[PDB]
DNA sequence: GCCTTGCCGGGTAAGTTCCGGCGCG
DNA sequence: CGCGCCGGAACTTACCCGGCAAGGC
């Protein structure tokens, strides 16, 4: 179902970029499974991310609630759900097998979470070099030149720099086809 | 002349894992 | 009894930001 794979990919990019997949073991022997996306902007979390997550949930017949917790520095979209946790964890394990629909959606996701949002330059930051190397090939096989290097020597944070040469192709094909490549 | 890109410190917006509670068969 | 949802919240740091300078045509 192409539908959901795409939105799943996009959300997985947000999770990986701005959240987490958590398997907690409480004393009990209780457990919990969390799919998490955090972000400072209440409006982005309630009006764009939560509707997408809701759709996905409704469609996978997941009965958990979309929690939205107001932490001090951050809003936290949280779904407590074993089904949804593995849905994403398994999808992450098979990330190399993504198809062109998902890759674009995954990159858009990853970018909205981890990207340069001024769009003056096109940069994506992450400590997981392997993840970036994967995004790099998808970008290469899509006509978008890019390089990876260590940007933050202090915290081991790599950057994937997208060439301003392929600027338009990137913004127009991957971020959003209604977004103008060269910002104010 | 203009553009692109690697560097690198600032400091915040993310991330991670505790807790106490309740529900399910 | 043995697990899985809920609602938080403390605590840590991984991003992002943005200026600078080398270098490419
Ligand atoms: Zn972010």
């Amino acid at each position: 179902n192409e539908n959901v794979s795409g939105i799943s990919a996009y959300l997985l990019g947000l999770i990986i970029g701005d959240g987490g997949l958590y398997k907690l073991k409480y004393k009990g022997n209780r457990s919990e499974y969390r799919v998490v996306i955090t972000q400072k902007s209440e409006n982005l979390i309630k009006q764009h991310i939560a509707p997408l997550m809701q759709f996905l949930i409704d469609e996978l017949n997941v009965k958990s609630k979309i929690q939205i917790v107001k932490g001090d520095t951050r809003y936290e979209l949280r779904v407590s759900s074993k089904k949804l946790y593995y849905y994403f964890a398994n999808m992450l394990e098979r990330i190399r097998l993504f198809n062109m629909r998902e890759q674009i959606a995954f990159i858009k996701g990853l970018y909205v979470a981890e990207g340069d949002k001024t769009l003056k330059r096109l940069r994506i930051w992450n400590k997981n070099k392997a993840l970036l190397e994967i995004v790099s090939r998808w970008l290469n096989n899509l006509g978008v030149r890019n390089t990876i290097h260590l940007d933050d020597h202090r915290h081991g944070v790599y950057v994937l720099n997208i060439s301003l040469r392929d600027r338009i192709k990137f913004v127009h094909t991957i971020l959003s086809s209604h977004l103008n490549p060269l910002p104010p």
Side-chain angles (χ1 to χ4, degrees):
Chain A
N1 209 32
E2 43 275 346
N3 324 72
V4 155
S5 63
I7 278 179
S8 297
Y10 176 79
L11 292 163
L12 182 63
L14 289 177
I15 299 170
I16 291 302
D18 265 342
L21 293 176
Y22 305 117
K23 193 160 147 284
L24 301 306
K25 301 277 159 168
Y26 299 141
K27 199 23 185 70
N29 312 356
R30 301 165 305 123
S31 72
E32 203 185 348
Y33 300 77
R34 287 183 180 176
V35 173
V36 171
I37 303 188
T38 58
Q39 216 159 359
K40 182 183 180 181
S41 143
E42 175 177 23
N43 308 94
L44 177 59
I45 262 183
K46 288 182 194 181
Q47 286 178 51
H48 297 288
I49 303 167
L52 290 183
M53 184 62 81
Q54 186 65 61
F55 172 82
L56 178 60
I57 287 175
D58 295 340
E59 196 81 24
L60 286 186
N61 205 32
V62 165
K63 300 299 181 182
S64 294
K65 163 188 187 165
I66 293 179
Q67 307 185 54
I68 298 190
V69 172
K70 353 284 184 168
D72 226 26
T73 70
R74 90 205 187 315
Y75 280 110
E76 181 189 354
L77 181 148
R78 183 198 298 180
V79 189
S80 197
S81 170
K82 171 154 177 182
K83 191 183 178 189
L84 196 63
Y85 164 91
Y86 283 116
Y87 172 77
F88 278 117
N90 288 335
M91 190 188 173
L92 175 60
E93 244 200 285
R94 103 195 182 83
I95 190 174
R96 286 158 192 94
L97 305 165
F98 275 22
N99 59 51
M100 179 176 178
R101 215 189 193 280
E102 291 166 340
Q103 305 176 352
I104 298 191
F106 182 80
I107 298 172
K108 179 180 184 172
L110 195 62
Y111 204 92
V112 172
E114 304 263 74
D116 207 295
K117 295 178 185 182
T118 74
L119 299 199
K120 310 185 195 181
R121 343 176 210 185
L122 310 169
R123 292 182 292 171
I124 304 173
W125 293 272
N126 205 266
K127 299 189 60 156
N128 190 334
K129 176 169 187 178
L131 170 74
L132 291 192
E133 287 177 344
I134 292 175
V135 164
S136 190
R137 316 189 179 118
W138 298 345
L139 285 167
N140 276 317
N141 296 346
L142 269 165
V144 187
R145 292 165 269 167
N146 65 90
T147 56
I148 300 171
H149 78 85
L150 187 63
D151 189 53
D152 197 338
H153 294 195
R154 314 163 289 185
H155 303 97
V157 186
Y158 298 84
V159 69
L160 186 157
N161 187 71
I162 283 111
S163 175
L164 297 179
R165 297 163 189 137
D166 305 298
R167 153 167 261 156
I168 293 150
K169 177 170 297 192
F170 178 70
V171 171
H172 181 72
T173 291
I174 283 169
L175 281 190
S176 207
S177 33
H178 320 283
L179 252 162
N180 188 281
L182 287 109

